[PDB]
């Protein structure tokens, strides 16, 4: 059994956020919902499809029917920004199942596009038998980005490490991504690219051994 959640939902403050949880015959099951704020442990915000525990504001409401359970957050505030998870028990497998999680972004300022800076490995690092490409990402809002690396025309997944976005002194976000290669890998391809996707648009920089 699988619970399908949208990965991302964005709303402006005061608006209503709706987060869906798809599952075959989920309407037969009791759905509970967790809220997890950055760095924190999950907290229950909706229990039994539509109840809320003590202390949770009544703008947090849920519904469940057919093949879709929905968490609705009315009059969204910045403090609501978090990852939300639905959970059910699948009796046929005796497994507790979590949705993939939905990141609710509360849009507190206008979109800002990423600046991307990409450095090739230094000659000195190559002399130490290593090679690291450095992709620096700055001045973007909201603080959510996906980075993909290419070598020549093809995707590379091995050796990539990317940080979570973090706030800058100007209240926009920054992140970095590193691609570790061997000197032979670096020298044998025509080029490597760092491709940064933010809010439906991609900024790509390319470096070459030449």
């Amino acid at each position: 059994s699988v619970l399908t959640q949208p990965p991302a939902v964005s709303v402006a403050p005061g608006q209503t956020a709706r987060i869906t949880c798809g599952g075959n015959d989920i309407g037969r099951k009791s759905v509970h919902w967790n809220q997890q704020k950055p760095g924190q442990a999950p907290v229950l915000v909706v229990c039994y499809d539509s109840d809320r525990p003590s202390g949770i504001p009544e703008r947090f409401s849920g519904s469940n029917s057919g093949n879709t359970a929905t968490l609705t957050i009315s009059r969204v505030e910045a403090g609501d920004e978090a990852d939300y998870y639905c959970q059910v028990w699948d009796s046929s497998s005796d497994h507790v199942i979590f949705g993939g999680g939905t990141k609710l972004t509360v849009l507190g300022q206008p979109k800002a596009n990423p600046t991307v800076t990409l450095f090739p490995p230094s000659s000195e690092e190559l002399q130490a038998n290593k090679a690291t490409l450095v992709c620096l990402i700055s001045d973007f809002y909201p603080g959510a980005v996906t980075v993909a690396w290419k070598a020549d025309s093809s995707p590379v997944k091995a050796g990539v490490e990317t940080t979570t976005p973090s706030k800058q002194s100007n209240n926009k976000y920054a992140a970095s991504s590193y691609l570790s290669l061997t000197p032979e890998q670096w020298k044998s391809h025509r080029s490597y690219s760092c491709q940064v996707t933010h809010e439906g648009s991609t900024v790509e920089k390319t470096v070459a051994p030449t």
């Binding site: 509970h32 979590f98 800076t117 620096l136």
Partner: protein, 226 residues
């Protein structure tokens, strides 16, 4: 004040085992299952299983059965999760949670989770205390404003945090951007610091990043040339 008090962060070598604890207070330990859930960095919640402290009955998730062990000691109201044969993809926060949400019907006879512990971080790494290597990031103007250039320093493969970076012994602060470290699969950190400077200054002014990794007693003053 129903609370679950979890043990502290652990750094383990690959192949080792780790046994994390979850102690109940503010309620009767044997009244409720304890569930275990882990979360890899940046990823979702993955249920590992549950144990009922009264009977000792267990329910292991398919993905974790056979290489983790849930136990409990009712004399001290504590549950344990032991993870064996640790690998780098076992790096995660390990949560316990009380199954305080009783079923409301015998059709859906499931006790759901209400109160969660704060989590125990487990980082699997072949890392000892290690000083970084420092490399120059040669000046580039391709993504800075007109008339300026970005140059930097790569601080590679150190453990543990933190590394601090200044520029020209602190005399240079404008336009400096030090990016928080990445934690790699190896369990080693890397970070970069870049400063945006006037392009006309490249021939005249010297730029040195001052890297200090106190945990390894390593300092490096790396000159960054055009």
């Amino acid at each position: 004040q129903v609370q679950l008090v979890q043990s502290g962060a652990e750094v383990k070598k690959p192949g080792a085992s780790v046994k994390v604890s979850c102690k109940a207070s503010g309620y009767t330990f044997t009244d409720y299952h304890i569930n275990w859930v882990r979360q890899a960095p940046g990823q979702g919640l993955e249920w590992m299983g549950w144990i009922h402290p009264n009977s000792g009955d267990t329910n292991y998730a398919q993905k974790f059965q056979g290489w983790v062990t849930m136990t409990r000691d009712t004399a001290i109201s504590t549950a344990y999760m032991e993870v064996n044969g640790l690998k780098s993809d076992d790096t995660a926060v390990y949560y316990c949670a009380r199954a305080g949400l009783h079923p409301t019907t015998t059709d859906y006879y499931y006790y759901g989770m209400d109160v969660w512990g704060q989590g125990t971080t487990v980082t699997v790494s072949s890392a000892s205390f290690k000083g970084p290597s420092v490399f120059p990031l040669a000046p580039s103007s391709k993504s800075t404003s007109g008339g300026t250039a970005a140059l930097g320093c790569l601080v590679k493969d150190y453990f543990p945090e933190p590394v601090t970076v200044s520029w020209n012994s602190g005399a240079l602060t404008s336009g400096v951007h030090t990016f928080p470290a990445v934690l790699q699969s190896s369990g080693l950190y890397s970070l970069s610091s870049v400063v945006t400077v006037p392009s006309s200054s490249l021939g005249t002014q010297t730029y040195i990043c001052n890297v200090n990794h106190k945990p390894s007693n390593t300092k490096v003053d790396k000159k960054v040339e055009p």
